[PDB]
């Protein structure tokens, strides 16, 4: 019965979610970079 009191810990499970969310947020943000080019919208160019 004392186990619920200690809960109401799971940081190892939240870290897995965070690491993937951070890689997906970074992957999308890297599309707004010119890399020394003229612009970053394949249309403009």
């Amino acid at each position: 019965g004392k186990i619920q009191d200690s809960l109401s810990a799971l940081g190892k499970l939240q870290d897995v979610v965070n690491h993937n969310a951070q890689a997906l947020n970074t992957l999308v943000k890297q599309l707004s970079s010119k890399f020394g080019a003229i612009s970053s919208v394949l249309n403009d160019i």
Binding site: N25, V28, K29, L31, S32, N43, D44
Partner: protein
């Protein structure tokens, strides 16, 4: 579509965003155009692939 220079593709739908008389096109998080405002009617429309 082309909205005064903005070249793209997508479906146009009625929006519920509010650009203030000084706003022309609110991009979303991750820096991609998500809404435009007509160039002679001032209607705000959402865009989506």
């Amino acid at each position: 579509f082309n909205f005064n220079g903005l070249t793209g593709t997508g479906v146009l739908t009625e929006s519920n965003k509010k650009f203030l008389p000084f706003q022309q096109f609110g991009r979303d998080i991750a820096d991609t155009t998500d809404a435009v405002r007509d160039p002679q009617t001032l209607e705000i429309l959402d865009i989506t692939p």
